[PDB]
Amino acid sequence: SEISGNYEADDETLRKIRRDLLDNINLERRHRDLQPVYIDLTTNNISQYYSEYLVNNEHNQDFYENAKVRYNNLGECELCHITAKFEPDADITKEYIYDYFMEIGYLFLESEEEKRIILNPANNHIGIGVFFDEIQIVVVLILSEKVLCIQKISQPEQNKIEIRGKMLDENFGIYAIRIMNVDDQKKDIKGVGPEFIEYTRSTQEWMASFELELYNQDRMAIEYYTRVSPDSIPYKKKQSKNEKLTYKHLQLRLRTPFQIYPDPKYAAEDEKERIRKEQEILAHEEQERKEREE
Amino acid sequence: EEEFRLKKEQWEIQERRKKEAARCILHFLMARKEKSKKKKKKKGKKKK
Amino acid sequence: MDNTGKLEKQLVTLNDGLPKKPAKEIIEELKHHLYQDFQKFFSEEKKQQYQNNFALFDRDNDKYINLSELKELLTSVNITFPDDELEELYNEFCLTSPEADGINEDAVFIIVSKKIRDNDKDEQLTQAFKLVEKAVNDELAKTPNETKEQEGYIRVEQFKELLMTLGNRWSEEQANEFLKDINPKSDERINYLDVVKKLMKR
């Protein structure tokens, strides 16, 4: 205890490292002319959990599958995780570990299997989880092919949710926004169809405004359904008094355990690093312009 | 002294929990059962 | 070029590696997951008490009590099931343990788990109504020109984002059905008291 010091990590730094790996993946994708990867809630949470488990324990296929079942994961998934040890006689610092995570992303880009899974054109949902201990670190990435990805979930009005999502599939337009109890699988808690959905097919994006209060919001997931030919969906269309939605014709597409995207903390922190990036860029460009004038 | 008093309180709580365990233990054998009859006589002379 | 097509179906296939471990180990780990919630749901007093109401009906000391013995344990602990629900719970454990002459000690513990776990879900859902009414009344008082009739009445925009806070996440998609189910009468206002009644009745 006297000799070995604590090595706890900030949640802000955790989010920084995770989204920085995500943005490095996106930068490489655009360098190669590849689509940028959005933050899938399922993949993000599962990868964070899996890296947290990895730092203290080795890979477990059955454990990962059971975690996916508990989260109610959906779709085919590909996992890319690495654990690396620190130098026997090297100092460990915050910036040291952050540049080490940069190097971890570079080694992902230098690694065949994980880079291929990251950059798979078919796969379109990616979630990152970075964790570590005093001795090693681990990075975990979970990618999948899905039609709808969440780009914004906001909390502007205390009682009006808005999960903004983009449909990456053209045949499929978000039709059913509903879920069942994670603990009570047979319990179809809450869901609606087009009449309470705002779908713009051109972007295949979707928003919505509807009602449900502080009822059961700690664990369960988000079950996004889609329909073929987004045109045929009566988006936000008044359903007759004798007309109710039918999910038996609605295809489940994304089960992402609920979380604000970006969660106010995620959004504020991300805006922080971005703004500091532009501040540094402007300072560097000012210095460059002065040097060029001289 | 404060740590000792806290430990004593925790020990009293654990004693109550062990009394609950004894309640569990003294709830099973109300009836059963069958005639431990014939031979437990092996009682070697050399005592402890 | 020419953007020739097309709407293509990126079918999301649920091939995410169903648990490759054998069904036996799947069962043990599911049982452990169920018991873990038990551990916190029931104080050590409750845990070391349920045996003090299980065994005497488990007269035979085989650690298995029939449905009648389970119900007697429940009555002694002052926790009661409906006849059908309690019989179903006992029979499920009896089937899962065919070599068991009923439900074991662990089975009775799990049945109480289900009971007081439903009770805790209801209690959390109810305490949700308290904060909901608090917020509704506060916002209504912030609008003195709105009659007290709105106490209980709440907007669609006043009924959604409370699904991000407590218990086990009802996401935005889990924020949809109750609206269609309860039919906001062309006003998009449905009483949070009516939601109290329905959610307590489910």
TrEMBL record, chain B:
Q: Which residues of the full protein are shown?
A: 387 to 434 of 434
- What is this protein for, i.e. what is its function? Component of the nexin-dynein regulatory complex (N-DRC), a key regulator of ciliary/flagellar motility which maintains the alignment and integrity of the distal axoneme and regulates microtubule sliding in motile axonemes.
Organism of provenance: Tetrahymena thermophila (strain SB210)
Its localization reads: Cytoplasm, Cytoskeleton, Flagellum axoneme
Superkingdom of this protein's organism: Eukaryota
Family of this protein? Belongs to the DRC10 family.
| Name of the protein this chain belongs to | Dynein regulatory complex protein 10
UniProtKB/TrEMBL annotation, chain C:
**Keyword Iron-sulfur carried by entry:** no
Which PROSITE patterns does the record match to this protein? Answer: EF_HAND_1 (PS00018), EF_HAND_2 (PS50222)
Full protein name: Calmodulin
Q: Which GO terms describe its molecular function?
A: calcium ion binding
Query: InterPro entries, alphabetically?
Result: CALM/Myosin/TropC-like (IPR050230), EF-hand-dom_pair (IPR011992), EF_Hand_1_Ca_BS (IPR018247), EF_hand_dom (IPR002048)
EF-hand domain boundaries: 45-80
UniProt keywords, alphabetically: Acetylation, Calcium, Metal-binding, Repeat
- Which cellular components does GO assign to this protein? myosin II complex
Pfam (any one):
EF-hand_6
Where is the secretion signal located? none
Q: What is the lineage of its organism?
A: Eukaryota, Sar, Alveolata, Ciliophora, Intramacronucleata
